[PDB]
Amino acid sequence: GPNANPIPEHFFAPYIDMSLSVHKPLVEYAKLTGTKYFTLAFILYSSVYNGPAWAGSIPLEKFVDEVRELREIGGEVIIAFGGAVGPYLCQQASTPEQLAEWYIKVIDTYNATYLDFDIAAGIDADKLADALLIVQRERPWVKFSFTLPSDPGIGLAGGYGIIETMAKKGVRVDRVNPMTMDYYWTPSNAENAIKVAENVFRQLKQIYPEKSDEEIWKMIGLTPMIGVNDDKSVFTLEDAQQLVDWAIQHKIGSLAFWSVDRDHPGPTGEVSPLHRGTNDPDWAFSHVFVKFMEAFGYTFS
């Protein structure tokens, strides 16, 4: 389209924490990582602006030019709300109407075609669904992704109720993206990410029993935390390769990871937003995950 670009059927759009001082232009990340699709994190409620802002404090419009430049090389973005630290727009908004207004302001500022609701805290799912009914009516070209905590013994946790609510209310659910990380009782590896995927498959089949197996896998994305996780387990480069091969075999919809600015070597086992606490060279995980898109037609020089 004039500005917005197509996202591939099978895509890799890793998270960038837009608020970090190390932040590079998106086009530069595209060159370094090999992917021209990113999930931009995170929009939160700012008291100062009484509305949406990066990290809940940085002007919403700050990155408009960067997105325009990425679109010049055929790239595209998913805008993410929420994450580990609040306050979320959906928590602060008093009505679904106010919430929808905020979401629509973000869509219109970025000409967004895909939003990601990264819900890792207690919320009022009914209010969210009511807001999203307004958003999809007013902006019917915008896809919705739900990124949620997960565990290999259960699949989605309370996040499952969010998807159940969406389905019942008639809110589009284009992507369900479990965060295959930080289990604390068992390590963040490929085997456990695959167990999460299988559990989420069963969960989505229970909500949408009319969907074919292929339709369910297409709805699923997986998002690990690269290298050292907060719980000290390590999602290794070997894990990355195993997960990518599994994801290709199952023709799932998407992969992402936390995070682009962490794809650098760092002191062993240290948790940082600026490196991954392993010795793999710069951009090593990015290059492995890009193979997921390459299997299905993607090329970028």
Ligand X SMILES: CC(=O)N[C@@H]1[C@@H](O)[C@H](O[C@@H]2O[C@H](CO)[C@@H](O[C@@H]3O[C@H](CO)[C@@H](O[C@@H]4O[C@H](CO)[C@@H](O[C@@H]5O[C@H](CO)[C@@H](O)[C@H](O)[C@H]5NC(C)=O)[C@H](O)[C@H]4NC(C)=O)[C@H](O)[C@H]3NC(C)=O)[C@H](O)[C@H]2NC(C)=O)[C@@H](CO)O[C@H]1O
88 binds, among Mg ion, ligand X, none (CB under 5 to 8 A by kind): Mg ion
In the bound state with Mg ion, the residue whose beta carbon lies nearer, of 97 and 215, is 97
In the bound state with ligand X, the residue whose beta carbon lies nearer, of 64 and 157, is 157
Residue 172's closest CA among 250, 213, 221, 115? 115
Instruction: Report, in Å, the least distance between residue 293 CB and ligand X.
Output: 19
Beta carbons within 8 Å of 99's beta carbon, 6+ residues apart: 89, 90, 93, 127, 128, 131
How far apart are the C-alpha atoms of 129 and 287, rounded to whole Å? 36
Instruction: Report, in Å, the least distance between residue 98 CB and Mg ion.
Output: 12
What residues between 68 and 97 interact with Mg ion by CB under 5 A?
A: 81, 88-90
Instruction: Report, in Å, the least distance between residue 170 CB and ligand X.
Output: 26
Contact 240, 193 (CB under 8 A): no
170 binds, among ligand X, Mg ion, none (CB under 5 to 8 A by kind): none
The CA-CA-CA angle for residues 6, 7, 12, to 5°, reads 160
If you search the block for the tokens 């600015």, which residue do you land on?
261
In the bound state with Mg ion, the residue whose beta carbon lies nearer, of 51 and 227, is 51
In the bound state with Mg ion, the residue whose beta carbon lies nearer, of 124 and 191, is 124
Contact 224, 181 (CB under 8 A): yes
Residue 24's closest CA among 275, 258, 261, 277? 261
Instruction: Report, in Å, the least distance between residue 6 CB and ligand X.
Output: 23
151 binds, among Mg ion, ligand X, none (CB under 5 to 8 A by kind): ligand X
194 binds, among Mg ion, ligand X, none (CB under 5 to 8 A by kind): none
Contact 178, 150 (CB under 8 A): yes
Q: Which residues lie near ligand X (CB under 6 A)? A: 15, 17, 19-20, 42, 55, 83-85, 118, 120, 147, 149-151, 157, 179, 181-182, 184, 223, 225, 230, 258-259, 262, 271, 273
89 binds, among Mg ion, ligand X, none (CB under 5 to 8 A by kind): Mg ion
How far apart are the C-alpha atoms of 80 and 83, rounded to whole Å? 8
Residue 180's closest CA among 118, 217, 225? 225
192 binds, among ligand X, Mg ion, none (CB under 5 to 8 A by kind): none
Instruction: Report, in Å, the least distance between residue 81 CB and ligand X.
Output: 10
90 binds, among Mg ion, ligand X, none (CB under 5 to 8 A by kind): Mg ion
In the bound state with ligand X, the residue whose beta carbon lies nearer, of 20 and 295, is 20
In the bound state with Mg ion, the residue whose beta carbon lies nearer, of 81 and 160, is 81
Q: Per the omega criterion (within 30 degrees of 0), is the bond before 42 cis?
A: yes
In the bound state with Mg ion, the residue whose beta carbon lies nearer, of 144 and 183, is 144
Instruction: Report, in Å, the least distance between residue 237 CB and Mg ion.
Output: 33
End-to-end CA distance of the chain: 21
What CA–CA distances, in Å, run from 190 to 33, 227, 241, 269, 278? Answer: 21, 12, 9, 18, 16
- Specify the DSSP element, H or E, that contains 191: helix 190-207
Residue count (the chain): 301
Instruction: Report, in Å, the least distance between residue 222 CB and Mg ion.
Output: 22
Rule CB under 5 A: is residue 181 a binding residue for Mg ion? no
> Residues in the site for Mg ion, rule: CB under 5 A?
81, 88-90
